[PDB]
Write a protein that binds this ligand. Structure first.
Ligand SMILES: Nc1ccn([C@@H]2O[C@H](COP(=O)(O)OP(=O)(O)OP(=O)(O)O)[C@@H](O)[C@H]2O)c(=O)n1
Ligand SMILES: Nc1ccn([C@@H]2O[C@H](COP(=O)(O)OP(=O)(O)OP(=O)(O)O)[C@@H](O)[C@H]2O)c(=O)n1
Ligand SMILES: Nc1ccn([C@@H]2O[C@H](COP(=O)(O)OP(=O)(O)OP(=O)(O)O)[C@@H](O)[C@H]2O)c(=O)n1
Ligand SMILES: Nc1ccn([C@@H]2O[C@H](COP(=O)(O)OP(=O)(O)OP(=O)(O)O)[C@@H](O)[C@H]2O)c(=O)n1
Ligand SMILES: [Cl-]
Ligand SMILES: [Cl-]
Ligand SMILES: [Cl-]
Lengths: 247, 247, 62, 247
């Protein structure tokens, strides 16, 4: 045989590069996934992640309450926290024994897979009673925030898109929904009559995941990295795996 | 009058047979329901059922965590089980005090109503972090598993369709979504522009049910049978009610 | 060992000890108990008996 | 064939009678079991049973403490009852909050299988510190109480032997061991050198059973009767199954 790494007859090398290329390109086809993650960061350094993976389009929608830190099989001040919610829904509406609940997120990061079209991204960041803009009568039900998403990059390739926002003030009390559509550079409308029922099925088939990790380190080691998910950490460091035309 | 059971002037007999026929045929019309059930079987002999009933199309989507046994108003090892999830999401990721959680399903049965079209059935059986096929980049977001569904039969009539799979190994750790479309032998697309908004409403109108029964006996007696639902038990015995052209 | 002594017991953890009393009553006599479960997971799924190589195998009794 | 119940050619009738005879006679052979039961009766109407089943010889030995009522998965005054034991072991030895513990047995019944030889029965009824007769220095370690055992009879056949004694006084505080030897009308000593090691194995092979039943009714219905065990109830009524030469 020829010698490895010296000619065009290195078939294991060419198959390696094609195997990686196919993965990148499959994800971007209309058969492939589009995924979104919402990361909510707590003052105790823990991170809630919510992930949804679906064909065609994907989204997540959470209430103010659902975004608050919840520690499984531990004490949570659950009564006092009911009271905190009443005080957040309406000023002086509750009887809590605290000024600031540490269960409230300090920051959100939204990340999309590189298969999204960034121009289709929509976000409904509501107040704590789930109203996008002060009052329903004047609310557009979303904002198109694609212009704010930063490319997460590895080796010069886009592995994901990130929008990061901090909630550092007492009045930063939110409900949150985000939505993105899978890339489609063709003129075949995946929602046209021919295929619209498959999109309806995709709503049922979307797989959800959610979990609270104790630290960003643990999130990176045991969630982001093992699954080849993209990420951007608090130090602005990029994670992901570049695959297009790469061994 | 003529004597019962001796002539074509037995109108109570003919109305009986028509009443049964109408029920069978209504369910199959575009006005009728399509229903799916997911049964998760636990080592303690109990069974979780999730049912969804809707027009046009129906589906269920559950996380790994949501499928685990939960005993209402009893002790559940909830802390230790948080740790079990961490160890299932990533090898050696947790600090649980057990090798195998008995809360994990030992088997799944998916059943559809006889109003589904079997060729439209789709299933997304993911790993424990809700990824259909190892990594998102190479995942088709579903499999069309209609070929595996067995007809549940009573008196020679199809009363339902069943796909049964056991999870008997330590690595059988899953998330699960299934979807089916109501039969439509016409050329009127229920998702075409004329009616697509009614399909969007059907997503909101779908009624869900879920409950943990202590035993398969209890499931058969108090869930399957009273509601005239189809079923297939561990002994391969069929339940349901045949209605087409029957008294 | 008795049937009861062979059942799983987790030291310093919860064991459903009341419900498991009821399970024993149902195992001793059909429909003899009022347990909230069909199958107790405390029941052994398998037994292995091992003797040292100093036994005479022909004397083993069970 | 001949007609049932009219001749000596009723083989199902003769096999029935032999099957019953064999059971009776097997039990009495040196290959058969000998069994003892200790019933301790509590003021709340519940009954503890301890059963041992073995070849050659059988016995039970319990401490004062082990004989006291214990309610599984319920409250038992366990601290106060430690104190009660201290007061029973030595007058004014404890700091209990009660004069009489209702956990103390009110009566004992000892029953042997009909395979025992009644003349071999021995009983060590000690005081609460497990001394047969006031002080060890003057204690014979047992009494031969066979003369007190009443035959439990069904249909004129001995199905068991019973010794019943009440503990109705404050000073009736006991430890208890009983022992009986399997009948052996032959001159082959089961304990002679030829077979003595089999007797040593029988000590290891003896199967034990113990359980607290809520009532004598429950004891009769769910313990005595299903297992064809002999019994004598508080009304002096006999239970058991006669088998010798019977259909
Ligand atoms: N604003 C108030 C008023 C009263 N309590 C009382 O204090 C007790 C404990 O408070 P809770 O908030 O329920 O905390 P934990 O029980 O410690 O935590 P968890 O409920 O999550 O186990 C409760 O019985 C509750 O009735 C309270 O927590 N907060
Ligand atoms: N791997 C570990 C480590 C510690 N614990 C501790 O043991 C106690 C009981 O365990 P848990 O799993 O919470 O079981 P239960 O309290 O019995 O059940 P439930 O929470 O469902 O009432 C908890 O306080 C928990 O802190 C545990 O269960 N598992
Ligand atoms: N069949 C029944 C009926 C009632 N209970 C009640 O439910 C409570 C908890 O049940 P148990 O079986 O005792 O479980 P745990 O207390 O959680 O476990 P452990 O006793 O081993 O600490 C008890 O107070 C018991 O009275 C029960 O467990 N099982
Ligand atoms: N002579 C005494 C002195 C003190 N106590 C105290 O009272 C409490 C309850 O008594 P206990 O006898 O332990 O009864 P329970 O806890 O109700 O029953 P169990 O221990 O069987 O659950 C205990 O904390 C014990 O310290 C007692 O029972 N008896
Ligand atoms: Cl495509
Ligand atoms: Cl129709
Ligand atoms: Cl013999």
């Amino acid at each position: 045989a020829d010698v490895a790494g010296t000619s065009n007859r290195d078939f294991k090398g060419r198959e390696q590069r094609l195997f990686n290329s196919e993965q990148y390109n499959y994800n971007n086809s209309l058969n492939g996934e589009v995924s979104v993650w919402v990361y909510a960061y707590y003052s105790d350094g823990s991170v809630l992640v919510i992930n949804k993976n679906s064909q065609y389009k994907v989204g997540i929608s959470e209430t103010f309450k659902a975004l608050k830190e919840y520690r499984e099989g531990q004490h949570n001040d659950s009564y006092d926290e009911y009271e905190v919610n009443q005080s957040i829904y309406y000023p002086n509406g509750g009887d809590a024994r605290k000024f600031h609940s540490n269960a409230k997120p300090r920051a959100i990061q939204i990340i999309f897979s590189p298969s999204v079209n960034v121009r289709t991204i929509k976000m409904a960041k509501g107040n704590a009673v789930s109203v996008p803009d002060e009052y329903l009568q004047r609310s557009h039900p979303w904002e198109a925030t694609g212009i704010k998403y930063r490319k997460i990059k590895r080796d010069g390739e886009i592995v994901g898109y990130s929008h990061y926002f901090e909630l550092p003030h007492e009045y930063n009390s939110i409900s949150l929904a985000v939505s993105g559509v899978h890339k489609n550079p063709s003129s075949y409308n995946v929602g046209s009559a021919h295929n619209v029922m498959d999109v309806f099925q995709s709503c049922d088939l979307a797989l959800r995941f959610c979990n609270r990790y104790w630290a960003e380190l643990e999130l990176v080691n045991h969630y982001i990295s093992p699954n080849a998910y993209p990420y951007l950490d608090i130090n602005n460091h990029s994670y992901g795996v570049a695959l297009s035309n790469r061994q």
